[model samples]
Target: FPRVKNWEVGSITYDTLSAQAQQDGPCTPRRCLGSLVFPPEQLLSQARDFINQYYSSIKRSGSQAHEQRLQEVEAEVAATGTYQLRESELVFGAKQAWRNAPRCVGRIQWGKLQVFDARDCRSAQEMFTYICNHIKYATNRGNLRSAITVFPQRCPGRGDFRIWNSQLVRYAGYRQQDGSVRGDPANVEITELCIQHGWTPGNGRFDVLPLLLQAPDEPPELFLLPPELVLEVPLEHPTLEWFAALGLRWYALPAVSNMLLEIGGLEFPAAPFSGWYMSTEIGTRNLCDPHRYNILEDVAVCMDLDTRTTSSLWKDKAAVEINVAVLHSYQLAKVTIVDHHAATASFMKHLENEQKARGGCPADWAWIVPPISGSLTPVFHQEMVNYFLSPAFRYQPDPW
Candidate 1:
């Protein structure tokens, strides 16, 4: 059988000196030393920080100095990427590690019971409603069969009694040998059995369904589903022979993998940015009504700088107030171009020139902004100037 690479057990170590020594030492010793592995948590945290800092520095400057710094940081990250676990360790390994870690038991013991008046018919109806409600919503119906079973039996005084046994519930779904739906729906009075077991109507215990109805309250009494074990399989480091399949360079793996894992399973909210509404009105400037010039209604542009970028456009207007989230990324770009009156036209013209120049106009010349002397100044001043001078400059679109 072909040999598999066990990255964790390889000569690589978390120790920095070990890594350095392996590089400078004899080839025989370096190969013998193998790979030293660090704790996954530490590795993950460091990798995340490195990626964040790398990107932050890149976005800060467009100058050759900043560009050189960005390249250096990128090179270091690429070098360290080889140590990251190959395959899908970011997801599969991390999830398993979290699951297998010991869980602490609660110190407090709590219990509650709601007894229905056996003689009251309303109480019985309430109890039935309560039990059904809890069963339908609270219980993990998918795993119900593994946790409980219901059986019908005649009670001497009671019209009919249903018995619930914990052992009868199984995870397997019922099916007929003929491949049609099996089991009589009428025959199973599952709720009746639950009521017989002391669950009250209307006021039944919904919260404790997991403890009493589905699984045992006691730790040992609770039956665990088969453990979903994911053994540490040997994963080969991508060498020249297998480099094409890996796609990205070795150093990029950890950062890229981290990003993929962070976003892959995310469930974004529906209509996440759908709250914006707008209107316009015109009135005489009166001290009594501060909204005299405010023709637009509920203009969300006032909410924040970020929202202003995507909100409705207010053309030919002066003094627009916007509310915006003061996040780092939101403040990083040319956010206030339209907000400040002095720079608005110039910014708009720059945008127009860029667009027109793209259409192949020979007469069009690029805008250029000579750099201003300062300790820290914006990069791409020339580019911005070029864009402003181009014929593409026209009426600036509302940032939105």
Candidate 2:
């Protein structure tokens, strides 16, 4: 075995299996296989390389525009020696990060992402404005657009500014009386954190979580999200009308706010990125995962399937139906969502395009495969390697 995962694939527990995979796959760069983290100097050099490559792509390599940028980067480093990407530079850098996102199967649309620059913002309050704009624009009345907003960069030897919400639009997960979570089980900690910060959380199944914004060396601030700004769809299968009675709804935009956006050697501690949801992320991970919604058995019951035997694969059969409902629901609502099968095939095409475009693409086999229907997708059979790359999205510690 070439150092594979501890648990066997197609195991009975997806919620547990995925959790174990993440826990075991810590972000140690070299020792850890996934996220790329380079020293400050190394990052700066990588940033230069990306800028140069970017300039070359536009047929501006060695032109006045290209040479001028290189000189400015050189001077910035000679003095303070850090990156300060301008509007255009930030735009290109953000796209490169998405293109370089190893886990994402939807990189075919990488070049079309909207980039909002907010590097001059100085407070958590300002971060909320950018987030609101992102949700509104990306949601776009159900025609979702992928977008990312960059905030202030990390200061050397100083605490970083941060966004505490895992995403701009996520449902609250309240632990209920029966020791079960009422809403999204994935967000229990953050939901409690919001309440601790004096937010009046809703007890509803589909209440959008508030934004918890953090400035460097300051207590995090909680801002309630306006419901009108977020567009949500009540999930129902085209045929299974009763599925809507389950009262399950989700935000259209999946704007991840907690991850660090690393470009070259500089880190944007408050960069929130969003892409149109891949149906499985919502249907499989969020809804089906045992630690969160744990609705596999519930769905199986609703389907009136043979739930008594393991050979029946009630969980597996129900998961596929739920996934189908998600894809159908989003399409009926006019929201953009990709099925895992389509996403993986696109990813395989991306690998070929990227291999010709760049030398190779860094990918993690664990992440490339969808949580449900693992063997049915093309990515399930592909071998992947993880490595450090400039312009990457990485997980960072929460800012209290």
Candidate 3:
């Protein structure tokens, strides 16, 4: 009867009779599902295939030697159980060369130009070498101002007078938590540590050893002061009085001379073949204005021509134009200031008695604002800021 009923029913139901009856019945535990796993062998095989294909393509693309070297490197890495690290050594070398090229040119120029004829060429050469060495070392150490004391007391054997004065510029760097960047504030401090002796043609030489040895730090007063505040101080302030007394006459020439010497030693390739070339021409015409009593035209022209050219050593590498611009601007500004200062000083002295009668102070007593100051002075201050203080003034080119 039960078998007939089960056959007639559309659905089947299990009846729990007694544990003893079902103990030997056909019942089994359910099978358990396991976690997924990946095969390392397959992954390794895929990686090997990728490497082989990549190397094979490299070899077929006219880089067979490079691919072979790469294979050797890979094998070495595999044997050593390490990975190969890629680096741009060529790029690094180019950067280094670019950075050093200017310095080399500077040395070459200095050597070629006989700025201080007082000392023998050998003496001048030594001074230039010393300055280059000092500056190179200081730059590496991140101390730009530390190399200023390398000038000599008169070119050796030419005279006992000092041709240059102490000028200090401070550069600071800020540490940002988020890796942000900003310029470290700067202060230019002008000082007269020694007196200037008179110059003798061929006797006034630039000595760099003393400058290197005696380079001083920026005065404590200059630190933490706003650039404007630093500019406000009178030129006669004791720190700068010596410099002011000398006036601006030929003040920038020594620096130019030094630069020329440095560049000469560097022997930087000239323009057309090299990136830029420097040349100097003495003016045959006195462009001085006798009526205005200004010597604006009485100066020599130092030209740095920027002729775009490819570097033999660096393919597709060109010299930086900005560096050439900065250098040119620096020299022009310097020459302008020197000429203007001399002309103005003469004019001021000529008007000294008249100014006194008119209750105008002497030029010495007059407030002489730096070129960086926005204030209007008898002298053009804006020119100074644009040419000297601006970042564009300091821009240099990257290495080829």
Candidate 4:
């Protein structure tokens, strides 16, 4: 059992629900793996457990329909070595996967996720259509919605359907002659892959990379995102008029395309998901992180701040301004976005709700806390226990 507390609020809770953890964490008595990003499964056992979970969720545990589902699933697997999830089950499982994600600070909206079942997708072309529809529906002209489009599950005898891009919307990174990157540095490899896959490269800093959609046993193909469907916010500060001259922009949707969605022992490799962005994710990390755009010094210099001395706190000042700009720009563009402060406050409420309902909430503290002001958020003072749960979103090996 784990005892957790919020030092700022003087509240305490014990994680009795952790006993129901479906898999062991990376930690032992000797050391804890709480801060690690990646922690690195069975078939029928998982299927049965997930079915039970679904039945229990619907208040039909051990009922005739529930028992019938269990038996039917077992029989299907026994006869054909695989089983299918009913539509309702697929919907339930997708939301449950979001709820079980430890890294998502926005799990308060988990139950409201839109699940698009593309299980009938037979080729890369069909997958592209499904993806486009999902983006259009989720974007909703910048009133961004949370959604996931699940493609077919991994088959035992076939190659996996995969999305090669890390996110549905990513800026192209061009490797310059001097070996410096000109765009978002994180996407250099995927941009190169897109070019090699026959995409016409764009020289601009904020060009959206094309999607590399791959069907089973076939070479990946590139699909350019329609410019109209991709809503972007040109960043501008509320007070700093000079900020707009930097020409920074970001997409409204932060759809992750490379994760594997596992539910009831079935793995869907191409289930892309998106929610509205937390401002700090773009302002503090993506734009300012050393390995990413590394724009802190540039912004600071533009502000005419003293970059010569660490005591001047130029980086901190510039980062806060950048976050403000992100929030301001997204709002000005009528795009849905949450600030770090409000996001973390809501997450604290989510934690309280989960504590009353489930005895505990699985959370990765490092991730739950905001990137810019770690100690300023409510989640910073809250202790969290990390564990694995089925019907979950998981990282998988990239399809090169």
On lDDT, the candidate that comes out on top is 4
Query: What are the clash counts of all predictions, listed in order?
Result: 43, 4, 31, 0
lDDT of 2 by residue, 1-400 (tens): 1222214242221111122121133455456635433314665567678787678678778778887888888888878857677677788889988987767778888999898888888888887888888888888898888889888898776677788888888888898778687788888899999999998988686778888888778889899888788888889988877888898887788888888997766788888888888899989888888887888999889999899998998988999889989999899889998898889889878866765676556676777888888888877766665554556787777664
RMSD of each: 30.2, 6.7, 33.1, 1.5
Top candidate when judged by TM-score against the true structure: 4
User: What is the lDDT of every predicted structure here?
Assistant: 0.21, 0.78, 0.23, 0.91
Model 1 spans > 4 angstroms off: 1-119, 122-127, 133-158, 163-172, 176-400
| Model 2 stretches with alpha carbons more than 4 Å out | 1-44, 157-159, 176-178
What lDDT does candidate 3 reach at residue 344?
37
**Model 2 steric clash pairs:** 43-264, 43-265, 44-265, 77-81
TM-score of each: 0.13, 0.86, 0.17, 0.98
What is the total number of backbone clashes in candidate 2?
Answer: 4
Better of 1 and 4 by lDDT: 4
Q: lDDT order of candidates, best first?
A: 4, 2, 3, 1
Tens digits of lDDT, candidate 1, 1-400: 1122213234211211121111122125345322221101343343444334333434653466545644543454466432322223222322221111111000000011111111122222332333333233222322111011111111123332211222112111122466432221221233234334454423221111111122111111121111111001111122223312222110000000000111111110100000000101001111002322121232323222233432434421211221111111122321111112122234334333423432211111111111111112121221211111100101211111
Local distance difference test, candidate 1: 0.21
Tens-digit per-residue lDDT, 56-134, candidate 4: 8777887799878888988888888888999999999999899989999999998899999899999989989999999
**lDDT (C-alpha) at residue 123 in model 3:** 42
Span of ten consecutive residues with least summed lDDT in model 3: 384-393
